[PDB]
């Protein structure tokens, strides 16, 4: 019952073994079949059918120990997410290698073993390996949580291996996460896009609005910023003639941690020459509907927005998705005209007064771009929760790198897609006129590259961790990152 | 002639066009076919053959400007690394949309243009696009050079536009990583992401504000991946950036791309076989052969042939030093006698003494000058390094003081490092990271782990002598 006592006893057991000549951590084991291959090959045997002439070397982790007398031992063996039974019968044991009871009394839950034996099914129909010999390969010195015991704690996020061993759902979640990225990489590659890597470290951190991380470069004797986005170097590659380009990799933002914000997270940003806003809308609807159907065989999924203790909701990913113009909707909802320029003193005061009258938290500093973001969050960002939708046509002052709207003054051809009130996608027609970049006349290198001619371009960015959360029914981003950022305890 | 005046003149042209009601940066051109698709579908056209009844919308970048008389204007149009010619002929100019000379007088080398026209070949046989209308999509305000050395690194877009061997170099790099991803995926490996920032060579140090604690950029992915082996991901790998805050040279960058995999129940021969399978097939997948040419000493000097036909030689580091230097290195290798011996061979050859003169560094120095260039004929492995050079590698089964470590070399440059894991916690001297020793106590199976230097591999497979030439935006000293 005392985990400390269990550990010291197991430590003494390990030393007891090796001063008896037996190496409890042997060098190699010539495994011949894996547990998933074993299940695939022998799922068809009848109950009680033994294949005694087929000798297999199989490895796994013991997860359950029981017996029926000293001459019959039963175990669960797991590997690669799959499970078989171990049925050790005294009469099938290779007695030359050692005493049968001595061999199997040592096995504890969590032990990694290598088994030489034959496949079969028991009379109870459970597929089993029937050992002639089992060898300890790596002992589990600790009492593994007793199943359904890691259910909720910080041990899952720190000792993630325990989480993957005990909780069957977690492995499926991270398998789904890799299937998302594989689908996204295949989706883009099928359409001619070219994957690249751009520096994790730059003298500026552009391409988004976020506080960066600062680190020191010893060789260059210079302070660099961890990238907050891949946007600027990617658009420079468009200038270089890589007309379809993208990058899936980590970005860093040094701000508040919560259930949808992790200091480092995975983004996909692609840039698509000679495409525009309308292509990006079509791309987003094509990708999400195809991705959801790929994983589920349907466009409708369940998501526990208000936790697992409340009824879920249905998110329907059947395209098209609704589009809402941010300034128009805010003006309609608040019955107030936001007069241009949006960053005028009057309009800033008018936006604050709306925020004051509705008791919406005033952002710091109350800049026009942030005030508009707060009004959008409070008034439109939770309009649709049964389906995803786009907030579109953001003002130029919120979109410094987006092309000016081709018919609506003061706006851009920008789109953000939201699922259950969370942004997962940001895209727009790319501003390619160097003289219209207010920051030009901010990277000197990027602004200069614009002067060599950036073709009309559409670009898009994705939040992969947030996408994985909805597609795996998780309310916290820590549950889709293998080792989330954590305080030291 | 003066670049500053050219940029000033071109900038004024953009403003002059705006005042005239023309937008020099239009929002959307509905392209109908790409340049490579265009070359594919009309390469077999007859000379002088037109197809007037097929109108096509095409985009590209003007890379050359010329004119025959004044009613025929000749251009080079490049896109996706491929080129056609623009045949602007006054007869096929749609005058309803603008003056012929007015349109084509403005076009400068580097302009991104959109073209409405038909496909055909000229009399001389050069496949051409014949515009009815040509629209400026995005203008090149500077003069594009023709030849240009450090502009390549600071303005990679110019390199990608001008050199046409830079584009091949970085297409090869992506193909290398794609092959590696698919190679591991077909073998049942599972790709994951582990943190770049931890509480852990010299590190890069950053600070999170709200948490108010320092974080360190990972130097490798070894530790979290091995923890995932404990967690039951028996075949796991990650491809991504790692950071070592040291000096820059042709084969070391502080930020570089690594692949690490860990493979439960793999033994030493499994790791050797994986390496020989991967490198031989990757080379063959790229070139249709196992033998490549590589300029070891730059393009000025002679090139050598590297044969990637498996199997590769295996060399034991200690026994090979002993044979080449004609001494014996008695164990423990960190005894005052053997260290002083190794110091004395270093002095006798006037090789640089590593600071500090620790046993592992001296052994690395001896390997570098006596072993690591044993073969430039082919890749080869330096194997079975002492335990004191590899604190995480399992002990050798039969040879005292050694491990089952393997290190693969191309032209004296390390590109691969692997070994079987020391999974017994009571033999791990670090135990007696606390997060790692704890994970060992829950049971790490016998496992093989391998790491790959993607940048160095791409260098050799694109005939490059500097890591700067395979990184799109190498980190440069600013002004
Ligand atoms: C300041 O601004 C930030 O963004 C920010 C700040 C701090 C953070 O941690 C501490 C994160 N960390 C994160 N963690 C997972 N996801 C995302 N995404 C995301 C977040 C906000 C808006 C839009 C998006 S998004 O996914 O549409 C975009 C990537 C296309 N951010 C983001
Ligand atoms: C052990 O290294 C280091 O302490 C180190 C120190 C400084 C560096 O920059 C400043 C790098 N940066 C780098 N840049 C490109 N390539 C590589 N490779 C590489 C380098 C040395 C040994 C082995 C390899 S390797 O290709 O076998 C791969 C398995 C790591 N390292 C590595
Ligand atoms: N860089 C943007 C995504 C791409 C926007 C289109 N250029 C972001 O971080 O939100
Ligand atoms: N992390 C090692 C490669 C894998 C080591 C084997 N477990 C390196 O950077 O050289």
Residue numbers in the entry:
A (entry chain A): 78 to 518, 535 to 582
B (entry chain B): 78 to 225, 230 to 281, 287 to 518, 536 to 582
Excerpt from the publication:
Compared to compound 36, the methoxy group in the amino meta position of compound 34 is replaced by a methoxycarbonyl group, and the substitution position of methoxy group in compound 35 is different. As a result, the ΔTm values of PfLysRS caused by compound 34 and 35 were both lower than that caused by compound 36, and the potency of compound 34 against PfLysRS was weaker than that of compound 36. To understand how these compounds are recognized by PfLysRS, we determined the cocrystal structures of PfLysRS with the compounds 34, 35, 36, and 38. Most of the interactions between the compounds and the protein were preserved compared to PfLysRS-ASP3026. The methoxy group inherited from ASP3026 in these compounds were all bound to the hydrophobic cavity formed by Arg330, Glu332, His338, Asn339, and Pro340 like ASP3026. Similarly, the carbonyl oxygen of compound 34 also formed a new H-bond with Arg330. Among these compounds, compounds 34, 36 and 38 demonstrated greater inhibitory activity on parasite growth compared to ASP3026.
